[PDB]
Symmetry: C6
Subunit: 306 residues, 6 copies
Amino acid sequence: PAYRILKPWWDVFTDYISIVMLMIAVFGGTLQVTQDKMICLPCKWVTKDSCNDSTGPTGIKYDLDRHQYNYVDAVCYENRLHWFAKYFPYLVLLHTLIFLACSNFWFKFPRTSSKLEHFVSILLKCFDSPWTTRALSEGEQAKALFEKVKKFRTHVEEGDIVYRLYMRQTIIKVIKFALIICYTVYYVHNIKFDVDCTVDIESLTGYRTYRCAHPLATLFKILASFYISLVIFYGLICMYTLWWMLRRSLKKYSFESIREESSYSDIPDVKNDFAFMLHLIDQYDPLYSKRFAVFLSEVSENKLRQ
Amino acid sequence: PAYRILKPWWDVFTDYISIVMLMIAVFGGTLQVTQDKMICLPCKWVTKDSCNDSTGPTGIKYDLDRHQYNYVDAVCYENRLHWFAKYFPYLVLLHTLIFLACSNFWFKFPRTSSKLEHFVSILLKCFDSPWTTRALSEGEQAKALFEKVKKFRTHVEEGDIVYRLYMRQTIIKVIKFALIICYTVYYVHNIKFDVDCTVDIESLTGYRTYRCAHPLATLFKILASFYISLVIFYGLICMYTLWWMLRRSLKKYSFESIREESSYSDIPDVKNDFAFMLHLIDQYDPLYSKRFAVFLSEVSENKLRQ
Amino acid sequence: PAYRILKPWWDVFTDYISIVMLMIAVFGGTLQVTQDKMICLPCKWVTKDSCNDSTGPTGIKYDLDRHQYNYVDAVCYENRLHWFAKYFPYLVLLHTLIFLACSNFWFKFPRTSSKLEHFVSILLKCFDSPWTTRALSEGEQAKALFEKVKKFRTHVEEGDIVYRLYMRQTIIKVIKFALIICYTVYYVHNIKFDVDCTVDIESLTGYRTYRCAHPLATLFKILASFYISLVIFYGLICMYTLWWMLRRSLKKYSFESIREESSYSDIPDVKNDFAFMLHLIDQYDPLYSKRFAVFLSEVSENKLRQ
Amino acid sequence: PAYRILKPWWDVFTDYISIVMLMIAVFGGTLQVTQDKMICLPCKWVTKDSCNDSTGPTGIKYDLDRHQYNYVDAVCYENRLHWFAKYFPYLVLLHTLIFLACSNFWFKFPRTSSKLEHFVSILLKCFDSPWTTRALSEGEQAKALFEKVKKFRTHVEEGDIVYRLYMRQTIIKVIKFALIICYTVYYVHNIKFDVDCTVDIESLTGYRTYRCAHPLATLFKILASFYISLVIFYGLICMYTLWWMLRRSLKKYSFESIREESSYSDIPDVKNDFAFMLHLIDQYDPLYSKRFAVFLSEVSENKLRQ
Amino acid sequence: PAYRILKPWWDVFTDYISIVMLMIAVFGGTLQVTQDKMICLPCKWVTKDSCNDSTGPTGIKYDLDRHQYNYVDAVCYENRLHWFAKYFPYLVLLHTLIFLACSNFWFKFPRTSSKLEHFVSILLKCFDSPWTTRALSEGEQAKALFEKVKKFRTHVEEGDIVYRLYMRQTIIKVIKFALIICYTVYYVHNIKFDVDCTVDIESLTGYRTYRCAHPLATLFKILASFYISLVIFYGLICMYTLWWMLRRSLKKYSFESIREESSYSDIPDVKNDFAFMLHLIDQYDPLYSKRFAVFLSEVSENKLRQ
Amino acid sequence: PAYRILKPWWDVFTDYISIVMLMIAVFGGTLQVTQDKMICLPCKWVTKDSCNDSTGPTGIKYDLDRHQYNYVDAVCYENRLHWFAKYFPYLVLLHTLIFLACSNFWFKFPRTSSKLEHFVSILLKCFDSPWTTRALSEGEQAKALFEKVKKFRTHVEEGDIVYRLYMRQTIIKVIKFALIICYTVYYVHNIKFDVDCTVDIESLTGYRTYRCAHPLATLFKILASFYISLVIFYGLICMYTLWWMLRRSLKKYSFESIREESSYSDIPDVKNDFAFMLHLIDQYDPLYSKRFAVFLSEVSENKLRQ
Ligand SMILES: CCCC[C@@]1(C2CCCC2)Cc2cc(OCCCC(=O)O)c(Cl)c(Cl)c2C1=O
């Protein structure tokens, strides 16, 4: 609904990034179940579990059918291949859904969605107010507004809940980024084209060690190296937020910059949880606060009462 | 329709969980009919239905074509493989559709949908009522409302039907969870990569026992271990409900907390099935009851009659 | 359109059942054209068209290529396999479309859709009628309603057509259920995994008899055993209907239960085809008849005329 | 748009039939390009281009690779297979699109869509007319209607164009049905499972004659035998139309059955092309003519003029 | 938007033809990337790059594996096959998109879309005009219309731009048709089933010449022969247009046929680019001009001024 | 929303081009993951890593199975094939998304979307203004408009931000085009059908060098040669823009061409960032400026004040 203004500039970049993070999780995923087979050949000559080396030349005959090649692929794809290479597309999906759903969980929990639901309502109407024109430079209906916003100020003034949740979201969408890099940089070298496996199934095929190949290992390094670069730019967004979300100390509002402009001084600072909801709407666009900066002044209420 | 308020906080978490439970039933299902073949090799040397064990090495030749390998796969996939491994994706779909449809069956049965249909109607209007402003702090049209809600109170006051059905839903969406864990934890070890089969078809192939492999056995342990963890968190939701749905004993309402605020005392407790429909809307958000806490007071009716 | 009230409780269960009956006809169908191949091996040793029986063991060599195996599969899938196993998904689709379309054919035939089209119209307005409030406890516009419903009573009072068609639908949606069970229970044992075929093509392959396998035979027994259980529960719905649709003998209406409540006695029973359209709307919810139980009373017409 | 009334009962059945005719053309078509391969084996022993006939038995070795089998399939699928078996799904699509598009071409040609566009307009308003209530039993605005329909009668009264086109549609949607049966019954026996081909490519494979198999030949007989039965029932619809479209001889209208009911006699028969547009709307439902049977009577115009 | 009237009868046929032209470009295209492989066999005996010719018979053994057959297919499909056979589905798509997009480019270029945007606006209102009723047989608001259309006549009267573009479209959608036939008839014989190739890769396979087969060559002759017949019927549409678009010489309008009917003579011919926009709307349906044939007459303006 | 007028003619062509650029990135991409295999044969005779050259002829036998051919394909597709041939479809997608998203980023950044959001609003209303009719040839409500646009002129008059961003977009959507041609023309010759590889895996297969083939190399030259031609035509669009975006020097507006027409001279030039938003709407269509050319004249304000 009408929550576009409620999202600052930095949380607009993030909503697009958290999609393209998902696009390379379904594209890498459909490409990993349809395919991501392994090819595997035995090594006749071997030295310590390593394929050492060996008129016109001719092929080598291992005397193996197709099902023995297809059996050893599954073994050397299940056992001697890192779980990160096989599950990378399913894993970035699980994480980006968290990074995404955490943002919107603050809009679904009814203890907090209700407070947002009517706060943006009274600001959206106050923006369109003929009296704000005169103050910036059948009134009894407009008096009920003054009593509404006076009630809605005294209704939400007991404690912080949305400033608690929205502070949790940027506390937990930074730890994840700090957790992602802990494992996604430490396990990307595990994926690689050339794979050697040794699985002890001599009884079936006749060989010990099998050199193998993972053809999509190169295409997953690209997505992974494109993913984590699509997550530090994400992480740089949320870092400046907490730099901005604690330096300001916005437990209350500061109307001191407009009280000179209106020259009324009958408008006091709002105590808690009415500032913060207002503080980011001014960070979105600074007009919507100065038109709401008049409904709290009793002189303006008096001039409206006339 | 306008039933969002009618769903408490715990039944909001559940509607999302009952989707992702389904997403891993269609994804595991398309991946089980397209594929989930079995590979199978015979074991030349065997000791009690068990593949015991056995210059440069060379392959083993079983002298089998492709159709004999493709025939024994079907046999050892039909007979010597547990039904739970093959039907897991179809089974969680059947169950999550029950877990899902049971929630909404209370909205379709016309004996009960009708009662919900107009109860939320009179609350949605009473929320938007100018007279509630004065009481919280051409009236003949508003008098018809007082007679409507007095009639609608005496119309629904005979017995409990929605409190019967909505009590059935959380009685039967707990037994299922208790039934799921009885079988889904006891049969997940049945699925496994390495499979040995012995099916007595020597007349066709020439061998008795065949070692086999199920490559998706690892991918189904993950979904199953992800599913049941996506069902105890579900089950923890419905457990607190019955803790909450019996401790309160909400056969009637308790207006005693607002009768001090209004200071009217002309508003009596509603007898049965008008409280419970109101009791969870107050559990959703506690405003919608205090604005409906005035239309029952005859002094307020008298002041409205003026 | 506004026909939801026009459908009793039992025909609400049925509309969902007639979908899931279709879901296992398209899922079983896409799975039967994409696949449902047969595997087939010859039997070197045979006794009366039956594969009798026969250091380390070795494979048996039939000296057949892939195209001879692929040719004999088509033969033993076309000739020695029951049509019910191959066409089950296409057959339940054909039947559920009949079971489904018969329900809605009563809404498309213009001789009967027209009568339904305005009957529900005059009831939907009469439900919202201020005069019904006073009777339950610029009138000239409401007089035209009294003349409309008096005309619409004398307009539809000649014979039964919707009571004829809606009686046909539950006469023909019971015979089908009785026809389904006659063949679907008598032919489900025909589908089975192990198949033996004998097709007399020695000239091409060299063998007489071929043991075969149908890997989806187990997955079709499940859908079939799930289907017919999804059709007797359907059939139990329509059985109670005719128990209810003949015991009542609703050729006319019985207003005798409300004539005490209104205490007017100026409202006579409606003769034919105006009761039945009204009789099931009262079976849906019993309010919509008692508000329509006043527009037929000439005293109420007189009090409205004042 | 509002053209539902303009379509009689028989052209309602037809719109559904002309869909399911198409559903078995896309289903038979996707199933014919994805697959509909041919299998082909050579016949070592042959007598006049016919595969005559021929301890434990053993396979026959033709000494052919896979590409020689795959080459001869294309030849014996291109040359020795009837075009009707390969193109049946594309052919019923081409025909059902004609059967379908011909119906709606009468709504697109602007010389005739315009006439339909305002004729249904003046009937749709006249149906909702308070004056029709009194006649069936600020008027100057209603006078303009009388002059509108008098003008719209004299505007469309010169000749027949929609009665020409709609007569063409049922002249050409009967000849096609008569053309379909001429070829679709005479060529269905051409499709059959067992196929023998002889193509003179000894230089490549080494054989003259090849027995073959067409596995979908049985599934196309079913659709074809289901299609033509889905076209004679179609053809039976359009046959009764011309029985009905010529027996009536509806070059003009006959208001003689209502002139007794109104007892005005100031309403004359409409000459041409205003009757036929009205004649089928009465065949849809007979109410819409008797309410339009008053706007042409000058006494009614006079009583409206008062 | 409301541009349906703005399209004559001939440009209505064309919009459907330019779809079915596209339907056989995506159907022929999906069928050409999924498949359209080539089969290729070597010719042991050859005379001048031509496969000349050559108890019970036996197969010929070329001693080739599957990858040598799969390598020579790509070569003889890339080199010795005409580009028209491989790219026909992609080529008719490119052309039909031009034939299609050129029609609608006249609606997107803002220099001309603006002129169309308000011309149809003033005609759509003037069609619904009570004063046209009297002339065909609070007026100050209608005076502004007379001044609007007098202004909109003097606003668009300087030169021809839409008559320039719409003349370009039928100049360039005839040259293409004349270009299509120049190449599509001269290259359809290139596609054919039997293909002989000779590619000089003896070093890999061992043979010089390879007979091949293109199984879809017959299905592309049908679409091509169906396509070009679906483009001359298109081309016959645009030919009559220029016969009609130059014979008339519609640089201005001719109101001489209605000036007798109105008998006013105060309505002069519109100079340029107001006639042509009006000339084709009369060619669509001749009513919309005679109702617009009154707003230009100063006597009608005078009678409206009264 | 209502931003169609805000986009000049050249940025309308571009929005379509930036789609078809994407259509050949998803079509080339689905065709590159589904397929784009490589075929590879060894060369028995070789001279310096080059396959030199070599009764009836017979095939060459390399004594290789299918898995050795399938292993060497992956190697010679991963190592000896240019990254541009494999990643071309993924690369044009990444670039066209930038070319596309950069255009619309100027509409999402809230510091600039807000300014556009109300500028087009006041022009869209002023276009529909009765007073503009008189000037081109309850007014207190129209006075508020004059004060609104006087305020909205003094509100946006401090600096340039949208003229900064929209200047950045055409500075960065020209450098990319200049960067595309730097690499896309220099790397298209890398893709080619015939490929020779040499990868040093003698230990597994037995050969050193393998001739290979890339069958889609011809289909990617076409898309690439079609792509870059679909990007210079794009690049020609943005080049004329900067020719037009600097020659005009539109830091302010020039009302001198209309001040003769109105003959008021009370309308001064707008200083900065109100001209440019207006300058391109006049470049779209020159009407919307002359109707907005009156609300700034105090004589017109005075005549409106009367
Ligand atoms: C005698 C060995 C050399 C010839 C081949 C070689 C040895 C094994 C393969 C090549 C040809 C072939 C083709 C086959 O079918 C291909 C299915 C692939 C698909 O489904 O795409 C099968 Cl089964 C077999 Cl046994 C065989 C052979 O005897």
